Design a binder for this molecule. Structure first.
Ligand SMILES: [Zn+2]
Ligand SMILES: [Zn+2]
Lengths: 293, 291
């Protein structure tokens, strides 16, 4: 089975043929910015032409939210000229093979899940802690995507009803307490200012103020994990992203989780897939859909 | 098909034959307390005899948690002598038919979902706000139960990291700020003491202190609903229970929810099934599983 996988990001569009989880014929180009909507139709025409006859199906990971084949977002302006872009329709102009679309965190979730023992692990959550907090949720071995592609936006679940206002407008989201943006909102105000990277370095040197800031983030992620375990019977959580993978961070998350009653505990491990997670995860998911009907 | 439906509670065991969603031969007995574990094997044998040959399958709703046919709980001591009771095995002694088990809030969820237009509503949550807070979660038209029957315990998701300690041991659960037990933990300390029922009465008379207490509960339920909408793409939430159905409560929940950004919104409405929700929901779910 030959998959044309596309990974459409904020800056780069990666494309490849994926066969048996193996990547070939890589290309990377800039995500259209000038006349973005018009330009994207051209780009997609170009990509599908370049790979003509090379694929049995198309799988597309994209930042934002996929709502019935259309690119959208909680705040649509974060996508600029691609807000409400008719992604599946534009690709279908150029091929009659099946086309599956998911968002980039859902694709990364699938990349990490494909290597699991599916008999042992059927309820699985990927959390990325980066500039923001994103998630992808797999229950009974199947990714949650219906009906409108929003499932997995667990960065926007409540962390503290007295916490800061989130970028989305809700008071106290996980993302407003735990994300890199949230760490930098505090560390940038220090005298002198520090980046999140510098805050982590001080944390590893036992600076008490920097430690408090990292603990604020890690404890919020621990409480999200506990919610997922008790609300959904999640069995395993994998954590990635620049903050999620920072040295010392996941051990702190797991320390907070383990202080809670035993029925909130689950397997928590670091993400193992890198740049190609979107291509591989999207390819795995669409094939899974097709195999299942 | 003909369903023998059992609803096993902390005080009463109800049984009945359910066919085409209609109940026949409703019977109700006391939940065993003396020598409870031994006694329950007898009770179940008695019930299976009374309805012998009248059912194609058995469906059992129970308080607590169903883990691979065993009756359990987050704190199994809350079940007394029925902790870790081998429920499915005990019933299977007396019949060869299929047996499905789910917990009582999950069954209530299915009772409310059964009447929905399932083309339009596939992601559905039932929340009961009573002495505690419980839930049942349906996604893509199917109830969540795997692997260990815990899914839906959303009363133990976080409401406030600086809130009270929950009965389960976690700090700040929805249940520890929103449930009737949490309302009473505050109203019982008033001078003079008040019950939640009296707190609600004062709330409806614009007593500011009682209003703050009821608002604390409703706001926590609203934030739970928002978490489910944004985390799971839930389309409808139905709220029941003595607190949930109290006059003026759900309007207050919907008022807090509607003040959040619109992408947290969904349909929120009162529970419409009563005492038979466990029997009817369990019968519907097991039939749905049988397909
Ligand atoms: Zn938010
Ligand atoms: Zn709790």
């Amino acid at each position: 089975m030959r998959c044309l996988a596309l990974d459409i990001g904020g800056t780069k569009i990666a494309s490849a043929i994926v066969t048996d989880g193996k990547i070939e014929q890589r290309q990377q180009i800039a995500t259209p910015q000038a006349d973005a909507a018009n330009a994207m139709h051209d780009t997609l025409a170009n990509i599908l032409a370049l790979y003509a006859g090379q694929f049995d199906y198309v799988a597309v990971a994209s930042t934002g939210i996929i709502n019935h084949g259309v690119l959208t977002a909680l705040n649509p302006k974060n996508l600029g000229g691609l807000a409400e872009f008719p992604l599946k329709e534009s690709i279908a102009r150029h091929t009659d093979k099946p086309i599956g679309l998911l968002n980039d965190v859902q694709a990364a979730a699938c990349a990490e899940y494909k290597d699991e023992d599916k008999n042992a692990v059927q309820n699985f959550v990927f959390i990325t802690v980066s500039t923001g907090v994103g998630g992808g949720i797999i229950l009974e071995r199947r990714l949650l995507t219906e009906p409108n592609g929003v499932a997995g936006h667990i960065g926007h679940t409540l962390a503290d009803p007295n916490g800061p206002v989130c970028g989305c407008g809700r008071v106290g989201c996980v993302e407003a307490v735990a994300a890199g943006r949230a760490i930098e909102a505090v560390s940038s105000q220090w005298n002198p200012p520090c980046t999140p990277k510098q805050a982590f370095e001080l944390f590893r040197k036992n600076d008490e103020k920097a430690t408090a800031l990292i603990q604020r983030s890690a404890s919020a992620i621990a409480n999200l994990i506990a919610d997922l375990v008790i609300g959904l019977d999640v069995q395993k959580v994998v954590v990635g992203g620049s903050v999620g993978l920072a040295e010392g961070y996941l051990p702190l998350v797991k320390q907070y989780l383990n202080t809670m009653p035993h029925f909130y505990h689950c397997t928590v491990e670091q993400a193992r897939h890198g740049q190609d997670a979107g291509l591989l995860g999207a390819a795995w998911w669409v094939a899974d859909c097709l195999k299942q009907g």
